[PDB]
Amino acid sequence: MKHNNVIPNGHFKKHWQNYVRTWFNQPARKTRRRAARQQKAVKIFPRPTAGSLRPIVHGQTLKYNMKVRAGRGFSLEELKAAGIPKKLAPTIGIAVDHRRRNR
Amino acid sequence: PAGHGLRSRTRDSFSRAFRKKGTIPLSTYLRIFKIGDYVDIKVNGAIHKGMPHKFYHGRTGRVWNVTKRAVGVEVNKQVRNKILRKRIHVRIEHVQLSRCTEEVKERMKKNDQLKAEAKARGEVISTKRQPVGPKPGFMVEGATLETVTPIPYDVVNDLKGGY
Amino acid sequence: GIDLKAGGKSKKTKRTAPKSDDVYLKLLVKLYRFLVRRTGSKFNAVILKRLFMSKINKPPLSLSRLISYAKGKEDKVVVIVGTITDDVRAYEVPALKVCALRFTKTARARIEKAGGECLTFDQLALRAPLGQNTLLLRGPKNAREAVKHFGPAPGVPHSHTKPFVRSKGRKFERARGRRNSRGYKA
Amino acid sequence: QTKKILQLLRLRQIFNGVFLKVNKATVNMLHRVEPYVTYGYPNLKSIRE
Amino acid sequence: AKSKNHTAHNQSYKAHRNGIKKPRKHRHSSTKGMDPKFLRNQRYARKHN
Amino acid sequence: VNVPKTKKTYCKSKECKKHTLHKVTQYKKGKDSLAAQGKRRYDRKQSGYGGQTKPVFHKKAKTTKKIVLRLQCQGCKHVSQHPIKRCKHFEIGGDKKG
RNA sequence: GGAUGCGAUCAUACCAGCACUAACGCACCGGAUCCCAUCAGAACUCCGAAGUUAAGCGUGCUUGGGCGAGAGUAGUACUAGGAUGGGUGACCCCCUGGGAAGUCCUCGUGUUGCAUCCC
RNA sequence: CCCGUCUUGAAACACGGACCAAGGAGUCUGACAUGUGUGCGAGUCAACGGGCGAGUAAACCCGUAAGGCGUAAGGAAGCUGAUUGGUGGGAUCCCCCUGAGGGGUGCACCGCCGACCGACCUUGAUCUUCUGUGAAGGGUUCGAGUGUGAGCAUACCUGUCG
RNA sequence: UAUUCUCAAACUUUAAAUAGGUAGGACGGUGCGGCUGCUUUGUUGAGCCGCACCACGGAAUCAAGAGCUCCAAGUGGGCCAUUUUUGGUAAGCAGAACUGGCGAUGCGGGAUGAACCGGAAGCCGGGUUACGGUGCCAAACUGCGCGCUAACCUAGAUCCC
RNA sequence: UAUGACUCUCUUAAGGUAGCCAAAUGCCUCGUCAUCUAAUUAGUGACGCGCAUGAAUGGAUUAACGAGAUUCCCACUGUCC
RNA sequence: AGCUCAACGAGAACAGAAAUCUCGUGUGGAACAGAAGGGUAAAAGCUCGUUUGAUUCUGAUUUCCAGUACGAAUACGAACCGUGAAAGCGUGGCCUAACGAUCCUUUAGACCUUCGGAAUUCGAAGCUAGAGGUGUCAGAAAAGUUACCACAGGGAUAACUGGCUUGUGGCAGCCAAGCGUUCAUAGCGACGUUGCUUUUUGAUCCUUCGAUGUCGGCUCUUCCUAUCAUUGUGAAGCAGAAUUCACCAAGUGUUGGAUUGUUCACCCACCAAUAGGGAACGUGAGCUGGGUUUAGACCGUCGUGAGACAGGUUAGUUUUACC
């Protein structure tokens, strides 16, 4: 080691050459996923290709509590308030989450 | 440190002058030091406080600070390929006002006076002093001439006072 | 033999032409070579010399700093061999005549809206061939991150040079040599 | 010291010549390089030629 | 196998390659290390100028 | 060396901030606690197989230690610590020289 | 022309032996109640003015010692640079420059600032 | 005097070399750093992914409060968080006169000294939920700070390191 | 007591040569006014700041120019020489000071040679030299002159040698 | 005269007994004496404060044996002249 | 604050060289912790009085030096103090040496910070300053042996020859106090002093460690002279005989054996004589292999031991030429 340089801390002391993952299949993966999406759309026609409806939820922690995103599924209390039976909601394209609490 | 003490090889440098030891005259403490004054560093072997390192003994510097008992002196020191302006503090007993620039102000005043006179009379002059140059020719009055000849050799006179 | 250093030849290197391959910059260089040769103008010579300089030697000038320097001289053509960037800290933009190698889109829009003009160096040659009534400006050359790491080493006394560190925090070069409680300070 | 004085006198090559005004400083400078040079009082003919 | 211990040979030549350089003295020198009381009074005088 | 039983010395406690009377004792290193994080780490490292995991100093060279005086201020009861130079024999309040 | 008080320089001012000094001073000098101090009123401290210039201080002299300056030692010793210089060597001459110190000899023995006082 | 090599010193009684052909040794990758070229610029970066498209591993397009770096620093931490300068040199330009002149202009950079933010110390009117606030006033202390941004991406040589 | 022979790296009154430091203006001077919480018995000083005037560049010579910054290679076995110089009987030994040289450098001379003398170098023509030479080897006189030597020991024959 | 049968002591428990030796074990050393030879640093026998011998870390001896190490004599011979 | 030390001179009963006391001289010739060098005289020395500046806070500088750290030291600033009438002095020792990082432990300081769901209290973890130590002292935690041995290298480095040198060894010279029945020099040469040689041994480390076969003997040739014998001479304390000194002189010769591996040495014998030496301490692809110097084994001494020994002993592969 010589000169004024940042102290090196490369993590290359194992057989790292045997655990290298390349991305030469990125376009192929994109093509495969698009083909799967097209097949699923053809299968579920005329159901929407975007999938089942999802709830609106807040971001976790103080860094993201001002943000709104998509949750896993509607709560049982939300379904009861809306008048949709929980056993029927999944069959008509509504995601159901029996864990989410309404505070 | 590193094989040599602070005062190593100062037997003669830091000793006082012959028949000049003892009490220090009051003129040493009755001197005035100001910023920018040139001072010579002369270590007094009897004053062990504020003693400069032996290197600065016998060197001239400029005053940059004035404390109650000491003065700051800026001394040039050659270290390899450059000169460092090292700043030290030295008690007034170890320092003496330098005479390295005694005639500068006098010369400037005389140059200004001469330039003023030249301008008054309408002339251009140079006040620069010049090195001693060749002298002109002159006549020397003839006097009695004494002849010098090589001395015949005598081995008896080879010793101081004779053998 | 002759007692000369390197046979009396120079050992200093300076730019004699742009290292860039920009054809427009080459044309500007030709223009100002002609101007320097046939006018002997100090302004033209300075412009020609700066046209050769590298990117870091042509730092940008902020709009707020440009306004501050042009205050009281709005009638003169301000000339910078470099880029002019917008400043969101500047509220009032007066009418200015500005010549530069490039303007950012926001800076150009603000100048045009305020009522000034953005000029190229060919237009500057047409307007002030000898650089008359011009305000020649330079950006901050030493105001970059790399400069902070230059100078005396971080570990020597009286040095405020920034060290090279992969991360910032308590565990990253703060213990020994930086504190009186861990060995020595500085 | 000899090399520096010869540079100051502008004598960088063997059989280079230069005029020098007589001064205490110049004479003392020349005294240091005496073994490397020969000098004298030029004639009017010498200077003209 | 013993080796040489020390010598200053060639060091003066090395120094004179680029030296001896005198740092340029600016008109105003740093006030660090001067009498703090005097410096404080000077700062107050400057502030009240 | 012999040091006196009492000493008039500065006390930087907010109560005094001046010279005060101090009682002089000799500092002694306290007992090592098993709850110290360093001791816990050392015990964890030593547990299991591998033998000694940290250095054990052997090349002792010093023949003396630096004696530390505990000066307890009689006004505020707070303690200050003062090292002294290396010595082979130390005592507090010994008979004064005759 | 001096003295005294405070000094500068710190022997041309010191050391030793002799001789001298008008006036004011400086001193020596008389005591121990007080302040003060010791074995010792010797010293130090306090209070004085009987007596003396004997001493101190000051000045002068010594074919005196020392000290200071000069001459000389001596262009000697030493020394920077040069030589395809001499010489077996040791050392040394020469060329361009610098340049000491004992002995011996001669001279001299303080100069001064501020303030008060006597003449 | 025989090349190459190590060496203070090689033609060496120093080592390799009987001869010819072909092969034969500073590379690729990751993290940084200076320099230079290019784009944009208080921003910059669409290639994780998505929409497509040379019927297509390319090219093109897409950033919702995404994320990285930058845009604020000082403290171990609780926590607090930049009042916006002066001056000596100095490039360029403008006037008067043609002196190494005078006046105005004073970018970059350098020297010096203030001010502001924070760690520490010190200080304390008024309010206040009684432990907070902060009129005034500071400091031979400390910082990889502030005082009208300079970065981000990308290409290559060189250098350290795995 | 007055003389006297001879001495010192770790003695010295005295005391060189060489070498070491500082200064010789535009970052100056003079005259006014101002600031202070420092300083003084005292706007007494100490620094600093404004205005006015002067300042022929303030010794010589040279100046193939001066300053500043960034990244980085190789090197970290040296050796030789005049003078100074330590240990050692001495050494082509071992170790230091200044400078130069070889190493990294050919070229002419010393027959021959890393260091000696001369001198440093693009490829050529002409002219002239340095050191060293001019009986042959081998370019240049058996050139013009004065003395000494006679070697029956291999007479003698050029710094380092 | 010398030594010490005898008595007392120190380290550390004791203080080399019976034996054996210039030994395959001795520096001085080619030790001293006798013998073997014309001549012997070799061999043998003897002596012994033995650098540094010694008792199953076995001491001393020993018939018979040995492709074991050594000295001498007879026979024998091209080992040699 | 006061005083002046060592030493010397002159005096006082025991008392003297040396006890205590008096006067005079006394430039430090004493003392100042220690090594040495500086420094100090109404003091830095001795005596006495009062004391704890050997105190707190951080910065600056010097020495070392990379102008890093540590140690040590210096000058200011901000406090509190000691002493003195006061100026002033004091930030350990008159100055130049006397000492120590990370991690961890432990002590002192704050109505200090944190234990991350919220409180209280223990406990723990933080901040500032010391202490426990690294003497290989810029700071690992560390016993031998190898002849059973191994690897990368080194002629940067020993064990031969060769090279420089010649102390030591060997071989000569000069002077002349003396020896030689008298007489310095027929023959010698004390006290001193100048040389030569590289057949001694040392000193050094220049060449050789990708190797120049390491003792001695045998055989064979050549070379030197500082000449043992032989040829020719001069000198004598040369009557003869014998002997000794010296000069030309290297043509010729210089032997057979006992002991020892021996070089060396010592004896026996002959002889004219049994001189001294070189040639890579001549000569191993010429021999030999007794000794040194691998691996087996015994003894003595040493070591707890593995093993060691400049001590002894016995057995232990000598390769290749046709260039």
Ligand SMILES: [K+]
């Ligand atoms: K770097």
Ligand SMILES: [K+]
């Ligand atoms: K373990």
Ligand SMILES: [K+]
């Ligand atoms: K090699």
Ligand SMILES: [K+]
């Ligand atoms: K070879």
Ligand SMILES: [K+]
């Ligand atoms: K962003």
Ligand SMILES: [K+]
């Ligand atoms: K903190």
Ligand SMILES: [K+]
């Ligand atoms: K290096």
Ligand SMILES: [K+]
């Ligand atoms: K015992």
Ligand SMILES: [K+]
């Ligand atoms: K038995």
Ligand SMILES: [K+]
């Ligand atoms: K057998």
Ligand SMILES: [K+]
């Ligand atoms: K002290």
Ligand SMILES: [K+]
């Ligand atoms: K070490």
Ligand SMILES: [K+]
């Ligand atoms: K082992």
Ligand SMILES: [K+]
């Ligand atoms: K010899």
Ligand SMILES: [K+]
């Ligand atoms: K050798």
Ligand SMILES: [K+]
């Ligand atoms: K070898």
